[PDB]
Amino acid sequence: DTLCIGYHANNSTDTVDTVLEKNVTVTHSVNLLEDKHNGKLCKLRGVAPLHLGKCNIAGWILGNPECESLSTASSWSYIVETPSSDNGTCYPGDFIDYEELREQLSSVSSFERFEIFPKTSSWPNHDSNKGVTAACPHAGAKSFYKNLIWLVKKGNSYPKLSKSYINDKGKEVLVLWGIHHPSTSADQQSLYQNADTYVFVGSSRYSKKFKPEIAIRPKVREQEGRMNYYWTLVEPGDKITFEATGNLVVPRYAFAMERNAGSGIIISDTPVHDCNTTCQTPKGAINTSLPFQNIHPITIGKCPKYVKSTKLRLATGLRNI
Amino acid sequence: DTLCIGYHANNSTDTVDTVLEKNVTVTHSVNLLEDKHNGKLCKLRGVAPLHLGKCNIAGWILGNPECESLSTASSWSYIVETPSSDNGTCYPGDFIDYEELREQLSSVSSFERFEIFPKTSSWPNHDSNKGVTAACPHAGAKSFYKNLIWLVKKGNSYPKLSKSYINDKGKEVLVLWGIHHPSTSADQQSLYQNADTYVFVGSSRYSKKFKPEIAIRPKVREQEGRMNYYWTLVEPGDKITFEATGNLVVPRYAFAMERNAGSGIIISDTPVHDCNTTCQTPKGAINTSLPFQNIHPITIGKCPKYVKSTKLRLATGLRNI
Amino acid sequence: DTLCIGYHANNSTDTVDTVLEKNVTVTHSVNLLEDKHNGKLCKLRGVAPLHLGKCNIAGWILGNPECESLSTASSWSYIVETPSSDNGTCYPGDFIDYEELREQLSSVSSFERFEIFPKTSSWPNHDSNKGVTAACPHAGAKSFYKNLIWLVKKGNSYPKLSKSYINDKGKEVLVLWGIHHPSTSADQQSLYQNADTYVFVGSSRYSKKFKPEIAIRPKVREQEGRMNYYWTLVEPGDKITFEATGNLVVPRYAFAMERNAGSGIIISDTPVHDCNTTCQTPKGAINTSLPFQNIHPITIGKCPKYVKSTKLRLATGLRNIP
Amino acid sequence: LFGAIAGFIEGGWTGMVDGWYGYHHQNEQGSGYAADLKSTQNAIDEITNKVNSVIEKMNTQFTAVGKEFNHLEKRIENLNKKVDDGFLDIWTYNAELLVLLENERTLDYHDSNVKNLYEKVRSQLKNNAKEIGNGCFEFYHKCDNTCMESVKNGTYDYPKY
Amino acid sequence: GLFGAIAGFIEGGWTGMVDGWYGYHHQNEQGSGYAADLKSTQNAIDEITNKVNSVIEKMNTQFTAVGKEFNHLEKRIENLNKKVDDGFLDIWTYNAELLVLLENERTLDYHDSNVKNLYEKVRSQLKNNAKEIGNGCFEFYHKCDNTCMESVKNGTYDYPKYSE
Amino acid sequence: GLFGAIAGFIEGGWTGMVDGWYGYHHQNEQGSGYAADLKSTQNAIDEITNKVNSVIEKMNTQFTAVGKEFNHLEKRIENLNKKVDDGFLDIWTYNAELLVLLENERTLDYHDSNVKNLYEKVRSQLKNNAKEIGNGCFEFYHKCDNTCMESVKNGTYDYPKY
């Protein structure tokens, strides 16, 4: 008659590591490391991301002719942008504080696009119909940005223009405009008719006087001229004033906007889907409660810490024999 | 006859957590987490902070008429600034590298304010008495910054002025100045009398030529004009040169200064007191030797690490029964 | 007859610390903390660092007359610069995005310096021989940067110049140039002969129109004038265009360059040597497998984590006794 | 660490599938394996709380790692890279060692539970049985099914040999 | 627990003993009472104290001013700064939380060990001269007086006193 | 200690034994001498070595160049950079310091355990054939020669007499 004492065992092959010994077989074990994603770009909170498709941010807000099929989303948790999207500033130039603008657009709570300066009633003394270029083609024909208007002289006359908008919205208003720099002094007068011009934009906070820099630049998209792009946020109740004797690419559409800081921009070919997630990576979403992940260093949301490990298996049972 | 063996116990209700078991009652325990502050803004080393009261940094160094506060501290460990302090640049404009100036003023070892260009003897060819504005009221009457002088034409005449200061102090000298941009070309000549003017400031390191940008800005504090503010640190032995044909708001007072890097600026309503502390937060000081604190993420000095925890109770005794 | 059981002991004095007890003597122990360096600046991979000697980065790329003696290295893992090196921009001015340039030059995979605009054939309508200054002395005589040319008027005449280079190299081309600001309107015309001038530099990405700012600056190196320095990277196949009516310090030499990001710049008097290392500090290299080091916070390469500790002795044996 | 598992009790029983620790009786009424009710429950409850502690204590902030910088911001881009790589090394090392440390403790925890189970029956059958050495006890009085009960239940308190 | 002593074969603690953490409860002809162990309790206090002091003293920080200011055109570096703050926030919160969980488990096992060891030092001293109850209590076979209990607490116990 | 063996009921160590960490000291008719345990010491060395290698090998870092340059108008981001450096400095200093304290406590307990276990493997093998002294030493009742001691060290100990 006997009574022995022992412990459990089974068919388990789960191995774990200890400080003292390596590859120890164990009866039961869990995994602390998450290495699995759904391969989709999902919603970050309750809100879906803004997918720009074939366009990037620049081409989206400026109103590139190719970015028509895209945006009137009231809000987004983050912005998706394919690595194959080249449609941005079609007219060669410099987008001032571009990266900064992207960061502030990365996530918005409300976003309505309104016509700040209606094309028909705002510019009676200038021509708002000849402002097109081969650099911005819409169906083989010469076009231009939808949210900007390229004002030129109205038959050998360019009077000092002076329009202004006052923010009656209940939120910040993103206003974009452009300054055109002709290639030759011949084009300057052919376009504005005054050889020495200036443009001034001003609000309660913004102020700057632009001077057209006339010279021959290397050809980009058939253009030896350049067109710089500027933007500013107009506080509620504040007003922004435009004044120019030429070279001003005026705003046609603006954006009433309420931004909620703390988001980013994903560049990925990964499909967008109608799914919920608390953590998003360029390769796909992560639905896990585990403390660590080795899927991707770049992440958006409340995510597990990125670890270089290949396996973090935590023993729960005992040795197997 | 017996001899038993056992362990201590008592009326203790102190509970702690273990990896294996939760809410375990123990005989004795200490707290690693500091969650208590004195609710005061104290001295950071031996030196007290500089409290600006109703003013912010800008209004303080420029010499805003309202900002007559803590006339002359020789030094400070950090700067306190109430969330309700709006008295800064009363004349609408842009303070260039403002945030940077604040960071460099945050802590100073010696700080004396001297008259760099005495008002009576420095400007014989210009008027140094009409430079006032409604934007900077001192008792309902039109005033201006105390540390700057707004030079205007002396009766239909504004000669090229050219003053310069050489740093004979034994330390860096903070020099501030202003460039005024009139709203209309009418105001330009009414103020300086020359329509096309320029201002040049230069030292051994600094150099820049300012061109007045005349245009109508939206009204701020009754002003359609703007006034930009500039500053620079003049090395010991070096000299700074001012040259202008108008639009120059010259320095009247400067600051001999010795800065010790590694401090910050607190924005809080918390009262300032005559107490010692090694660690300071906006909500109050922390007198503790514990490794962790959950009082405030923003801290100044040699402080405990900010933790999100609500309790870090470390068991010292044994189970209680 | 007996059989006892016990443990090892010896002459060891190695002490370690535990959570419960301090200064505990043990039989054997290893050190986790590295506190020893070779006191040399070594090679970071297989490549040696670029030592500038008496010059700093600025004086090196611009071509300061004093920086003639050691450049044409095809590549470097990092850049060494002595705390006593002051020979940089000898003509007082501002080096735009200077720190940024240094960071992008810190490590290079290929680096050849070629003459972008030959001095003899490029400027027929301007004088390319009078552009010298006392601020840039070469043997007591007035000289200037080797990689730049200070174009002045050719006998009471400064025609609009318009040269351009197209990048036929198989890599980025670093192009440097200068804009000169005379002290007086008298010097302006004496130098260019047109009172109101402009300079424009442009590529497929870069574009800027410079306007000379004429005024009297405090004297630096005998100069009341200033000379600002600008640079840009021109993409392969792209072209950069220069256009000016004066005040332009044109490029003479450029640099075909392939950069590999992820390096830095060491400022130290420490001697450079022909040795291999995986981790480099200003005070010397670190050849260790240990996880921690207290030699220097600033490090370059795959290095141990910098710790404030004075000793991290890990016990391996057991307590030591009689 | 406690000598029980892989020690004086060389192997485990594929036969016992009721819990982690148990018994194997061998009397006149038959044989069979039977896992300990109370002992296995505590282990499961405590090991579960352990896994939940390593997980639940990791609640992170809503942040968007990843920033954009232009060609003239290579420095702050490398600063940003440094702050990312820094966190990468701190978490990788801590996680790796956390698992090594806690796996050693978990195995010792099971070893302990077995040792303790062995000790609770040994200090209960001083003379009424003998130590084999294989973690098995050999009775001297006859022990039936209702007898084994008083050992498992710890109520072997009215000893009749 | 981990050593089987506390909350194990010795079910509860004694509110009666207030001299130290571990002790005895004698029951002879001269009376009863509780008496904590001198040496054993001292070491625990000394070692537990050094433990708390280690978790604290090893944390000496740098004089730094967290918190920076950025204007509306520096939102990026502001978010970088925010990331470096939140990063440190998560690393310390997690490490501190787990440090306390881990060390609390070890501290409780440390006390459990001390009791087990105290029980073993007495058991391997009274082989035949007493019997194991199982409740962490020993029953003598020869009569044991006050001066007798001393030789057990002091570890100086003569064993050439085998009676019945 | 934690297991009671080292610095516990076995007060000191033997400078005489130099073959390994744990061993025996026999005292029969054929003589005396120290002899370390073959198997026991080997495992300790193998496991302690893997321990040191784990604390080291698990630290593989990224190729990065700490240290940045900033001009007089970039004092903020310079202080940001300083903060990110000091932050890592405090995290690693504290973790390393505590890692060594914790693992040193465990390593000493690990050796204490190995001794206790060695003592127990011999004790549960000589129930009646010997008696406990209390100093970690056993006194035989039957005569034990050299070939006898072997059956104890090897764990192959028969029990056919008194």
Ligand SMILES: *[C@@H]1O[C@H](CO)[C@@H](O[C@@H]2O[C@H](CO)[C@@H](O)[C@H](O)[C@H]2NC(C)=O)[C@H](O)[C@H]1NC(C)=O
């Ligand atoms: C939208 O993007 C496409 C693709 O980049 C642009 O078309 C390319 O233009 C470049 C530059 O001349 C050519 O070299 C490519 O061959 C073009 N690709 C294709 C598929 O045609 C296009 O110009 C963009 N649209 C607008 C309005 O800017």
Ligand SMILES: *[C@@H]1O[C@H](CO)[C@@H](O)[C@H](O)[C@H]1NC(C)=O
């Ligand atoms: C255990 O105690 C903690 C400590 O505050 C408390 O928050 C918690 O409510 C308790 N556990 C549960 C499940 O309520």
Ligand SMILES: *[C@@H]1O[C@H](CO)[C@@H](O)[C@H](O)[C@H]1NC(C)=O
């Ligand atoms: C000072 O601040 C108050 C409160 O905002 C403001 O109304 C007032 O105009 C300011 N006065 C001056 C002189 O700046």
